RNA sequence: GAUUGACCCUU
RNA sequence: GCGGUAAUUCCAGCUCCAAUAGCGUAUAUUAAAGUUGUUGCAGUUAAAAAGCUCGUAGUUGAACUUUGGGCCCGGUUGGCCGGUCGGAUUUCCAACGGGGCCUUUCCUUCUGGCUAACCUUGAGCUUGGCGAACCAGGACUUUUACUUUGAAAAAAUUAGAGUGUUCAAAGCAGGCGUAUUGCUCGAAUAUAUUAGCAUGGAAUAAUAGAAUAGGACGUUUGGUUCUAUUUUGUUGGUUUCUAGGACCAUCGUAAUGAUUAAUAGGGACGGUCGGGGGCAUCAGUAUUCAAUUGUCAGAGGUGAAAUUCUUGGAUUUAUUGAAGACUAACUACUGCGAAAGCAUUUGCCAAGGACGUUUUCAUUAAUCAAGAACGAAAGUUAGGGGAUCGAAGAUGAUCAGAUACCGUCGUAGUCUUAACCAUAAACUAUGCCGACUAGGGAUCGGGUGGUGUUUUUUUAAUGACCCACUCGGCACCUUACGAGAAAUCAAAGUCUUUGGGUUCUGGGGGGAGUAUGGUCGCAAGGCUGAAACUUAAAGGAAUU
RNA sequence: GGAUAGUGGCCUACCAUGGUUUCAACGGGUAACGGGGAAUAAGGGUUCGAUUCCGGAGAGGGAGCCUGAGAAACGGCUACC
């Protein structure tokens, strides 16, 4: 009988079984528990502003050896600390001190992208001016 | 236990057909079985069949030919409307030119095309093609 | 088969096709009826009445010889048992197993079989209550059963 | 086989089959009129007795029950019925 | 039937 | 994945490939996702069949009751008919739910009004027999589910007879005069689950009838309750079948009156069968240890070895005795049990399958949330027991180290009695019930049969074997009918030709069987049981 | 019986454990106003619907009321944080 009940009055059994077995899905469980609004760093939001705090002695994944910086950021709405990855060459000019940086996800819905372990976010704006605008030299960060 | 006598009959017919046998024995010969076999007979899918009368429930010996591809039963007997007949036919028939979805209606057991010609509907039983 | 076992045994009487049988029997339907009631008064269940009618005398079955079956005859003639024979025998077997267990606590097999037999008793008694051959709220109790059997 | 007449099978095969596996199942048992030597005392007894069947005349039991068929007494004349 | 434990670099 | 002094991937010279006034990003959501699977997943080995049974709710549940025969219609063809230079339908004999007749097969009382399918010829659209196709009152679609026909998702959509906002998205506009007149089509069509309404239908599933007759009609039959419609002088009142009904006697009618007995299930009986279970209790050697004379210096152990016992006699050999455990060889692709498990005799106690049955019941059934019974070993609490073996530990050795493997001891334990525990690779890693599909050498419990062998009498008879062979089991043996990723599987088949019933479980790997909250437990722990976070594999068959 | 504009445990005196519930009551959560309704299929549809239309609610939160046909009205009054 292929497992599942087939009776014409077994609709309640089928619905309840489906309700119970929906929970095995990763995204359905997150949606119905509100894990975005309780424990996601961004509070279920696409982007998040933050204040870059300090340097931490972290090491990149395979293959490299690069310990210069990866921005620790304190969010404004949550106050939580997240590590973000400055997404272009010449990261030095934009991490001066206590800057306000806008952060987006890395694109994997909450997972690390590549050779960067434990980093789920990237920087798109530095004090209201776009990071790739500074990278392409087409706009200037406020120096006065 | 024995739940669907029509399903057991249709499964026996299918197994004998696939094995190639020219005849099949069926127990225990319900009236729904008789009507289903009469529909197959009218559309030329089996041939002849005999009702052996033991006093308990009856048996049926069906002479098969090479024509039957698959006879099946739809359990449960889903309530089918005029809107749903096209749904079921496009779900479980090889094409729109042959094969019949059989359903018990208020005017007895018939196939879907005769049900449309009589403008009636009912509960789906099975299918032949 | 065997609701309380894994046995798949097919073993039953092959009832003949002939409902008016067997043409070598030249005794009367009333005579068979009177033998039935004399046996019921003697204190036999319909199973034993039928086995004796079929064996000691030539009686294929009371259904085909007279107008009905043995339980129907007894109910019509007032010899109806208070509880049906199968339920009585199930209760008797359960009472026997319970008396055995009382002396043999360590008999876990007997405990299991007592659970099986009492489940059968409750199912059959529920059927009898539904068909109303038993009074409503009729219930099988272990203490009352010993007196109910004997 | 591929083609065969189930409607009219051979009596040999039907007798070979189980009593419940025939077209119309029928009992493979039978009855017999038994007469003890001396007094005729014609009584009809079932083949599978399950009972020490005897007439009410005297101690002249005619069969002994067994697993299947009843083994009739040594001095007894049976007639198939 | 003994003692043979280990061996940092990419498809 | 690229980059490690020869980068088609980084930063630049690059045809600027692709979309384009747009394009790239991030989060959520949708299809792909048959990776939520009613349609339509998977569970032997990839995640997944609860250890095993019982059982309530739920889901599901054998067959049977009116089935078949004859005339008339709005309404399906190429149409000798070409009558209208493809709407033109008579012999139209190729078919129909529904309105009527015969086939034992009728469209609800009893009283009326138009006066109910009409017994009623007025020299050629009728004064009285019978009702439901409107209305009156008591009555029934005993009850559904189901299934075509109308307010039903009040408003824009679905495509539009049509419509130039620059075409188009869009709104509903718009179009034409003998142009001094003026006229006008049109803005409707699908109801967005379920529900309540009215209507036709009877297939598909019935507790309901009538059975220990307080069952159905009786114009024929004598007896108690509210209106009085017949009046004599008036809204209160009496009486002879009452109009709307409750017990009476079959003078008084109808074939008064119970479907099979499912290779469904329960129960009874019969002869059996089994290492199924529980008790009193029997026996067997062995192990260990003890009671004696004899014996000689080694002996038990290991791959050479050494804690060890030993001329106060060790091991080896007496005749024995005691204890506790176990039940060898028989012993098997053999049996029984729901599993765990169960192998010495006798008895007792209850139980069970299979088979046989021309017994009985009659659908009592299948699977099963909650809820329960049993549940190896180890472990726990006490009391017994304590031979052997032996987690711990003691100890000799090999070893770089060896608190391991190997050697000798050795508490707990191993054995029982009450009470817990409730786990296992509790495995066939394969849920249960039902059906159906190449064929066989065999085997266990029965075992239709074959004037086939032995002690007795080779010349009746109660053995056992040998051969046809049914039935129910444990299993086996060669392509594939088929299945599968394969290994392999007569089931893991009858699954994209996808639905027999039903329970449980799984949804990438880890974190983690963790945390937390319950709950059971003396405890150990058992059952239920996550998230954060991390991750691109981890896995399944061995192809070279 | 009272109060209502009106039925009604909406409240008052006496009389029961009556009513709901595994066909899931009660409790908890909702980053839940509900419906008409975007995105797909002749049937898999899964989400979303604060938001142009309809029905609700509120006018910082609770409470109370006058006038008025109509208000517990807050661009009307009477009382804290």
Taking the C-alpha atoms of residue A6 and residue C20, their distance in angstroms, rounded to an integer, is 44
Please check whether residues B20 and B33 belong to one and the same domain: yes
Residues of A in contact with B77 (CB under 8 A): 8
The phi and psi torsions of A47 (rounded to 5 degrees) equal -125, 165
Angle value at C-alpha C51, between C64 and D75, nearest 5 degrees: 110
Taking the C-alpha atoms of residue C84 and residue C91, their distance in angstroms, rounded to an integer, is 11
Taking the C-alpha atoms of residue C37 and residue C75, their distance in angstroms, rounded to an integer, is 10
Elucidation method: cryo-EM
| d(CA A48, C1' G60) / Å | 30
For residue A101, give every residue at least 6 positions away whose Cβ sits within 8 Å of its Cβ, in sequence order, or none.
A49, A50, A51, A52, A71, A73, A84, A123, A125, A126, A127
Kindly provide the resolution of this structure in angstroms, with one decimal. Answer: 2.6
Could D2 and B25 be called an inter-chain contact, meaning their C-beta atoms sit closer than 8 Å? Answer: no
Instruction: Name the domain count of chain A.
Output: 1
Taking the C-alpha atoms of residue C73 and residue C69, their distance in angstroms, rounded to an integer, is 6
Which of residues B18, B43, B68 is at a domain's end? B68
What is the span of the domain harbouring residue A129? Answer: 1-144
Please check whether residues B34 and B76 belong to one and the same domain: no
Angle in degrees, 0-180, between the axes of helices C108-131 and C85-103, rounded to the nearest 10: 150
Q: Which of residues 47-86 of B touch A (CB under 8 A)?
A: 75-78
Q: What is the domain partition of chain D in residue ranges?
A: 1-81
Q: Which nucleotides of F are covered by protein (CB under 7 A)?
A: 1-4, 10-11, 25-30, 35-39, 41-43, 49, 53-56, 58-65, 96-98, 146-148, 200-205, 211-213, 258, 260-272, 276-279, 337-340, 349-367, 373-375, 417-418, 431-438, 446-449, 460-461, 468-473, 481, 493-495, 497-508, 530-536
Please check whether residues B63 and B76 belong to one and the same domain: no
Query: Are the C-beta atoms of residues C27 and C21 closer than 8 Å to each other?
Result: no
User: Does residue A15 approach strand F to less than 7 Å at its CB?
Assistant: no
* Parallel, antiparallel or unpaired: strands A100-105 and B23-26: unpaired
Please check whether residues B57 and B73 belong to one and the same domain: no
Taking the C-alpha atoms of residue C2 and residue C4, their distance in angstroms, rounded to an integer, is 5
What is the span of the domain harbouring residue B120? Answer: 69-129
The two tokens of residue D66 are 């067994």
Please check whether residues B81 and B100 belong to one and the same domain: yes
Which residues are paired to A72 by β-bridges? Answer: A83
Q: Does C24 touch chain B (CB under 8 A)?
A: no
Query: Cβ-count burial of A69 within 10 angstroms (0-12 exposed, 13-18 middle, 19+ buried)?
Result: middle
Angstroms from D4 CA to nearest CA on chain C: 25
Calculate the CA B84 to chain-centre distance.
19
Task: DSSP letter for A92, please.
Answer: G
Taking the C-alpha atoms of residue C119 and residue C114, their distance in angstroms, rounded to an integer, is 8
């Amino acid at each position: 009988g292929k497992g599942k009940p087939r009776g014409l009055n077994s609709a309640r059994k089928l619905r309840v079984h489906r309700r119970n077995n929906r929970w095995a899905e990763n995204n359905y469980k997150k949606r119905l528990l509100g894990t975005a609004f309780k424990s996601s760093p961004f509070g279920g939001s696409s982007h998040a502003k933050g204040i870059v705090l300090e340097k931490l002695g972290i090491e990149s994944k395979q293959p490299n050896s690069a310990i210069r910086k990866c921005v620790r950021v304190q969010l404004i709405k949550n106050g939580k600390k997240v590590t973000a990855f400055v997404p272009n060459d010449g990261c030095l000019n934009f991490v001066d001190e206590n800057d306000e940086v806008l952060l987006a996800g890395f694109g994997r819905k909450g997972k690390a992208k590549g050779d960067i372990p434990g980093v789920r976010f990237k920087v798109v704006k530095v004090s209201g001016v776009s990071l790739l605008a500074l990278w392409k030299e087409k706009k200037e960060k406020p120096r006065s | 236990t024995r739940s669907s006598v029509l399903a057991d009959a249709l499964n026996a017919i299918n197994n004998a057909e696939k094995t190639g046998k020219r005849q099949v024995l069926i127990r225990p010969s319900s009236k729904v079985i008789i009507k289903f076999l009469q529909v197959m007979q009218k559309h030329g899918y089996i041939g002849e069949f005999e009702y052996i009368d033991d006093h308990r429930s009856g048996k049926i010996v069906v002479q098969l030919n090479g024509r039957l591809n698959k006879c099946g039963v739809i359990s449960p007997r889903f309530n089918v409307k005029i809107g749903d007949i096209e749904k079921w036919t496009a779900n479980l028939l090889p094409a729109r030119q042959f094969g019949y979805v059989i359903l018990t209606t208020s005017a007895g057991i018939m196939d879907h095309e005769e049900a449309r010609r009589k403008h009636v509907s009912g509960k789906i039983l099975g299918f032949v093609y | 088969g065997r609701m309380h076992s894994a046995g798949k045994g097919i073993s039953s009487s092959a009832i003949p096709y002939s409902r008016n049988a067997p043409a070598w029997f030249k005794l009367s339907s009333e005579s068979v009826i009177e033998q039935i009631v004399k046996y019921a008064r003697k204190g036999l269940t319909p199973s034993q009445i039928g086995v004796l009618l079929r064996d000691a005398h030539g009686v294929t079955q009371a259904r085909v010889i007279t107008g009905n079956k043995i339980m129907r005859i007894l109910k019509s003639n007032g010899l109806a048992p208070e509880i049906p024979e199968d339920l009585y025998y199930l209760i008797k077997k359960a009472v026997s197993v319970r008396k055995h267990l009382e002396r043999n606590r360590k008999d876990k097999d007997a405990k299991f079989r007592l659970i099986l037999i009492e489940s059968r008793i409750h199912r059959l008694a529920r059927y009898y209550r539904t068909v109303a051959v038993l009074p409503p709220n009729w219930k099988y109790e272990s203490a009352t059963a010993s007196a109910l059997v004997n | 086989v591929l083609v065969q007449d189930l409607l009219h099978p051979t009596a040999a095969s039907e007798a070979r089959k189980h009593k419940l596996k025939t077209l119309v199942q029928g009992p493979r048992s039978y009855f017999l009129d038994v007469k003890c030597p001396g007094c005729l005392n014609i009584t009809t007894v079932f083949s599978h007795a399950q009972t020490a069947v005897t007439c009410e005349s005297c101690s002249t039991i005619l069969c002994t029950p067994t697993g299947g068929k009843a083994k009739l007494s040594e001095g007894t004349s049976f007639r198939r019925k």
